[PDB]
Amino acid sequence: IFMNDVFLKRLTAPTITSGGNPPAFSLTPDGKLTAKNADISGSVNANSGTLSN
Amino acid sequence: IFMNDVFLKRLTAPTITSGGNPPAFSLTPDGKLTAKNADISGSVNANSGTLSN
Amino acid sequence: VTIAENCTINGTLRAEKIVGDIVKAASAAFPRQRESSVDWPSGTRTVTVTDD
C-alpha cells in the first residue's frame, strides 16, 4: 500500500523504517532503535551506555 | 488519509510525528529522534553524549 | 558507563571510588615509650595496601 501523508490514532507496527540503503532511522521487533542523532528534552534512563565522548 | 487504530507488518515512512506544534516525539528524514524521555532496558551505544546531569 | 575517550564534567564530580592515577597516602607515628620525663620511639607500624 502506497500512500501520501496519513493521520492516525494508534499504530501497531513491529518494523518501522525511514527508507533507504542504511535507513536514517529504524525500529525493529527486537527492540532496537537505530538513528543518527537523539535529542531528548528530559531523562535517558538506560541500563548501560557506551559513548566515545 | 485519516485512519483509526490500524495494525501493520512493516512501515516505510521517512517522517513520523506525534502531531502538534511542539510534537512530543518525532523522527525526521535525517535520522534525528526528538523525545521527552527515553527508557531503554539495554545499551545506548552513541558516538557522543551531552547530558546536564 | 564505558567511555572510550575524553569525558569532561563542567560541574562537580561526586565519585565514591577513584581508580585513576591519583596518589594514595597513609601516615603514622611510631609508638612512644616513656619514663619519668623523657620518651623515645619504640614500636611497630603495619601498613597494608590492597591489590584493588
From Swiss-Prot, chains A, B:
Q: Which domain of life is it from?
A: Viruses
The protein's location, in the record's own words, is: Virion; Host cytoplasm
What family name appears in the similarity comment? Belongs to the Caudoviricetes tip attachment protein J family.
How this chain assembles, per its entry, is: Interacts with host LamB.
Q: In UniProt terms, what function does this protein have? A: Attaches the virion to the host receptor LamB, inducing viral DNA ejection. During tail assembly, initiates distal tail tip assembly by interacting with gpI, gpL and gpK. During virus entry to host cell, binds strongly to host LamB in an irreversible attachment. The binding induces structural changes in the tail leading to viral DNA injection through LamB trimeric pore.
What is the official name of this protein in its record?
Answer: Tip attachment protein J
Please name the source species.
Escherichia phage lambda
State the covered range within the intact protein: 923 to 975 of 1132
